[PDB]
């Protein structure tokens, strides 16, 4: 207990896989999907990795289509580095981070601390997605 709780956050705009511009409690704020490693569609280098667009097409719809978006704090720091709040985005009770990590659209990633609350979860879905030969693992 005294663990966590989510707070509603209203959408504004989906940027890229791990990047969601969401109107958070007051002023507009960018947020980064916590713990996933989803490919890009922007980068002056690399370019548009395979599953790049797709991975994003997932995120944009999960959130754009949700009825109630709650965001979740990680025991590290809301301030990321680019500002971009770090959080656990949910869409109608579902974890947007896991969904992508389960449909093979971002591998588990950037392990740090004390953020890890959902570590052995994204881990189990990914394995499953790994057992399967889904999208990113094919």
């Amino acid at each position: 207990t005294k663990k966590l709780h989510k707070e509603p956050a209203t959408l504004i705009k989906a940027i890229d896989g791990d990047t969601v511009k969401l109107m958070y409690k007051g002023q507009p704020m960018t947020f980064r999907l916590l713990l996933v490693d989803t490919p890009e569609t922007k980068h002056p280098k690399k370019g548009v990795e395979k599953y790049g667009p797709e991975a994003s097409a997932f995120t944009k719809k999960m959130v754009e289509n949700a009825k109630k978006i709650e965001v979740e704090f990680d025991k590290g720091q809301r301030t990321d580095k680019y500002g971009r709040g770090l959080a656990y985005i949910y869409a109608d009770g579902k974890m947007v981070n896991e969904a992508l990590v389960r449909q093979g659209l971002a591998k588990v990633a950037y392990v740090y601390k004390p953020n890890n609350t959902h570590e052995q979860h994204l881990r189990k879905s990914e394995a499953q997605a790994k057992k399967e030969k889904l999208n990113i693992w094919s």
Partner: antibody
Amino acid sequence: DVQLQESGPGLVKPSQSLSLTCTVTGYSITSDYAWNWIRQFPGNKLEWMGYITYSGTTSYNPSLKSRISISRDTSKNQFFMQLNSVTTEDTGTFYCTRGNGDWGQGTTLTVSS
Amino acid sequence: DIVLTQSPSSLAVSLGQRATISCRASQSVSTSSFRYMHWYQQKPGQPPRLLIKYASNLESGVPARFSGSGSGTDFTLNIHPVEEEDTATYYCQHSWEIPYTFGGGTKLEIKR
């Protein structure tokens, strides 16, 4: 691997609660076997009831929300569902389903004289 | 709240011939990984079983005769080399938004 055992049949008078269930082999429930309750009136009518996830909160279909619920006895590997104030308009089978595969063999409930 | 309509309500096909089951969506359900419609099969006395995962995309274990197609709102399940065990009622489901609405049902009869 993966199995969905549910409570047996149940005649019930119109208005006196009961709880279906889904013990779940091939797992334990934590990382999720996200339930997704379904109803099926005698004849042919799959109606989505609602769901419940790893987080704990649930999400009941707009249509018929309150007086119907979904619980979580994980150690005793189960999620439950209650239909308070049962009505004749409630007779049918109820299937729990995992949020990525398998369905349960369903529970039949009836409600008459 | 999208209402799905699949027809005809009854499908009787000569054993070994094609069978196309249609499922129409009120609103459109597609995107860039979506075609958010899946297909279920239900034998009598039994619970539905998953057949296809995202319009196309056969599930695991399901034979290769089943094939879903469809863009926008017209989605169809194809089971061409149709067989004896293909007697069942096949439903469509959408997960573009909750409530997840199921299909009205399409009964498949095999003639001989």
